[PDB]
Amino acid sequence: VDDVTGEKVREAFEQFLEDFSVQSTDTGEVEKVYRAQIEFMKIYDLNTIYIDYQHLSMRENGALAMAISEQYYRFLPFLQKGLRRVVRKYAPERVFQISFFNLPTVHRIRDIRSEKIGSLLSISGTVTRTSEVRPELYKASFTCDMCRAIVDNVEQSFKYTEPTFCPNPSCENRAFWTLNVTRSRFLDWQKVRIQENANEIPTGSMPRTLDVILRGDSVERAKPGDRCKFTGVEIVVPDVTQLGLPGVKPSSTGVRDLTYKISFLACHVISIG
Amino acid sequence: MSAALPSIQLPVDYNNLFNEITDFLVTFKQDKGPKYMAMLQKVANRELNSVIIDLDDILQYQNEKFLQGTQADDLVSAIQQNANHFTELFCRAIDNNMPLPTKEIDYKDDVLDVILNQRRLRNERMLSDRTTELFPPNLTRRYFLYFKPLSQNCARRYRISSKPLSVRQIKGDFLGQLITVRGIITRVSDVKPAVEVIAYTCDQCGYEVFQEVNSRTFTPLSECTSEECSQNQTKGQLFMSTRASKFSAFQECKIQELSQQVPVGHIPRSLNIHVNGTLVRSLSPGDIVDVTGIFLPAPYTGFKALKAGLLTETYLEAQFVRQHKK
Amino acid sequence: LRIIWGTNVSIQECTTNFRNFLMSFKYKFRKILDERDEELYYIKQLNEMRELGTSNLNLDARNLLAYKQTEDLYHQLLNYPQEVISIMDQTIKDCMVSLIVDNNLDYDLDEIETKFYKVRPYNVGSCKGMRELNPNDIDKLINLKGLVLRSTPVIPDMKVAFFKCNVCDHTMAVEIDRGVIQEPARCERIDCNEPNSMSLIHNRCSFADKQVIKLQETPDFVPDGQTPHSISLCVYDELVDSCRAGDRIEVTGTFRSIPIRANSRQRVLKSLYKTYVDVVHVKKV
């Protein structure tokens, strides 16, 4: 089902960058620029790409980008596997991040609504109160009671938990959340608070904010107080601290209520303005 | 049981003192029909819902059979020791001697008039097609009960609970009696919808379960225990509804001293007061009032930190207020 | 007749007088004014609304006072302000079918029929703020007047839930439909013969907007003890970001009460309830 159409967006994207999306010849951009973008990262090894959004939508006439604009969150397992089938036919300690840019529209803070969860969009704002750079886990090696410390798979999510199946000892799913730093691959991120631009808003009534996560190789590119555009994803984060203004928050029948709020994720930041 | 929670006998008995309540009702002749006939029926005709029983009528009814006729035990001095068990039991005498179908069963003079009939007729539809649990009696009341003390002339004749005590005079031994105080109402809060009975809905077996409500703490139930769903593997998930239960008004305030009964030493104090029922929004801060009502301690609240002196919190229920500067 | 059990509302094939109310109403509200315009208001708004589709019907709704055999739904409006509106939302989808079957095919066959619609009626009389609200009128349409204090950002709501297993089998969704979400024990492509742990991936499941607004009313006709009273509102997706701070608003909506927690970690509840006004239509500034 989703495995089927997940390979279709995989094989189309794998067939996309193997072909060229640039027409003007004899003045640059000749013969599959994305193959030429690979070899420059083969010399330098910074593990990223910077591909256009319009250039994806020019070939199939938006037959593919409308899914990538809508169901963007589900396809990053399938876009990462599709890129890794390409470079192993090209290039011989590796991780890869897929950055987009050149979007048609710029949205604002007041137009943020929950019909666009897992989609792609841009936003402009003012950067305030940056923080420090810290590692995040993203892959664990949690051992067990027996000497088999084999743990390179499950529970890389946003919960800091360890796995349940494939038991090393003869026991069941024992205690969890162990991170043995001998083999675990951390990336770095920081947290900033974006604020709406001054010369758009009406009469001054404390304009609303967000908190944005900058993952990967985008760190310390946000200056304290300059305007920027960003990438599309809009996650929601489980939190505990929201209390005092109650609604109908559904319970979990270990009892725990669920409180949600909005947080923004990025992959490419551009400092226009 | 023996050797733990023993039985101490008391000189005051409660068995016989139900019948003399019944004869203080509509079988009454001191005040065509008696005063407890029409005032009950007017409430039954959905024109009032606050039945204000007086206490002086208990005193005059005693003299009608004191040294005249038979010998009977005292009730006004029985109220002035307990004053709370004579509230749920004084109403227990009313519902038997009260005609329900006197009024029309017409459209909305109050809400939950059509659904309570559907609450009442479905319960007899539950007990029709079977060949035995009904709604609790404290749910179906639709009035209230109050009391007023006596101060003017009735005590001087042959000898109480109407002396204007100050706030500092309230000892620890008055916990359970009727008192009357005075002072200055301050820090009065608003009206908030409380709850005294709760209706769930199983949504699969239909059997609506209930429980009783005590102050500041109540626990929700487990999943359904009705015998149609249970004794199997399939048990329904029950959910609370608000259109199926009884609510009431509730308020809070604090009464300081009147600053004439203050000593030259100690600094003035305050009591907490809960106003429950249809006397809500009948007070206003910054005046001189005379509040009556029963005076009972607040129960155990949790976390076991400040406790074992129970944090009794000494609050004071209200029954009748008598203002000044009318 | 199969009347709804706890609701006492007449079942469908009886509420079709709302269709007849929607077609014939010309001078009936002007019977009070003594004619000091010859057509019905709700014909002309119906022709302009199908063009754009964004329904948001105003519905002044002092029209069920003067019409033949519509007093009963008007009295069943205030007593049951949730169900009869959601019942009317079916007919506001169904009355638009009645033009397309009669007139020629508009809008390149259809799509506007699949759009849901809302009705936002108002002017149900005059209520008296918060101090005069008795707690025995729980679900009635209330008129409220006051200014607007500080507001809050957007809070999402679980509308469709979603699940997964540790096995890579089929991931099927469930809906909430109540106050609490449920979760199964077994699955298809069961997952170790019904032994497994249901996982909750909460980013692919849909959501819904909610903003809470703290309203301050104006308790006039003062009894010389005066609180600037706070009333919370629970506005939904269509009328978000429509109420700025410092504005006097007449608002209409239903009225609720929700139990609260004591330790917020235990299974005990607090007996006193808390009230908020789930709004339906916000009108004026």
Coordinates of C-alpha atoms in Angstrom, one line a residue, chain A residues 73 112-119 121 157-159 210-213 215 232-240 242 258-266, chain C residues 154-162 200-210:
Chain A
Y73 CA 7.0 13.7 6.6
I112 CA -0.1 28.7 10.8
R113 CA -2.9 26.2 11.2
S114 CA -3.0 22.5 11.8
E115 CA -4.2 21.3 8.4
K116 CA -0.6 21.5 7.3
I117 CA 1.0 19.0 9.7
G118 CA 3.8 17.1 8.0
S119 CA 3.7 19.4 4.9
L121 CA 6.3 25.5 3.7
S157 CA 12.3 8.4 18.0
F158 CA 11.6 11.5 20.1
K159 CA 11.1 9.5 23.3
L210 CA 7.5 30.0 17.6
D211 CA 10.4 27.9 18.6
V212 CA 12.4 26.5 15.6
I213 CA 14.7 23.5 15.6
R215 CA 19.2 20.2 12.6
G232 CA 8.6 23.3 5.2
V233 CA 8.0 20.7 8.0
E234 CA 5.8 21.5 11.0
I235 CA 6.0 19.0 13.8
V236 CA 4.1 18.8 17.0
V237 CA 5.9 18.0 20.3
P238 CA 4.6 16.2 23.4
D239 CA 5.1 18.3 26.5
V240 CA 4.1 18.3 30.1
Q242 CA 1.0 23.1 29.7
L258 CA -1.4 14.2 26.3
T259 CA -0.6 17.9 25.8
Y260 CA 0.5 19.1 22.3
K261 CA 1.8 22.3 20.8
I262 CA 3.5 23.5 17.6
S263 CA 7.2 23.5 16.8
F264 CA 9.0 24.2 13.6
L265 CA 11.7 22.1 11.9
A266 CA 14.1 23.3 9.2
Chain C
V154 CA -3.3 28.0 18.6
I155 CA -3.6 24.6 20.4
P156 CA -4.0 21.5 18.2
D157 CA -6.7 18.8 18.8
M158 CA -6.7 15.1 18.1
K159 CA -9.4 14.6 15.6
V160 CA -8.2 11.4 13.9
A161 CA -5.8 9.1 15.9
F162 CA -3.2 6.7 14.5
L200 CA 1.5 6.0 18.9
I201 CA 3.0 7.9 16.1
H202 CA 1.5 11.4 16.5
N203 CA 2.7 13.3 13.5
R204 CA 0.9 11.6 10.6
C205 CA -2.5 11.8 12.2
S206 CA -4.7 14.8 11.4
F207 CA -5.5 17.7 13.8
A208 CA -7.9 20.6 14.5
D209 CA -7.4 24.1 15.7
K210 CA -8.5 25.6 19.1

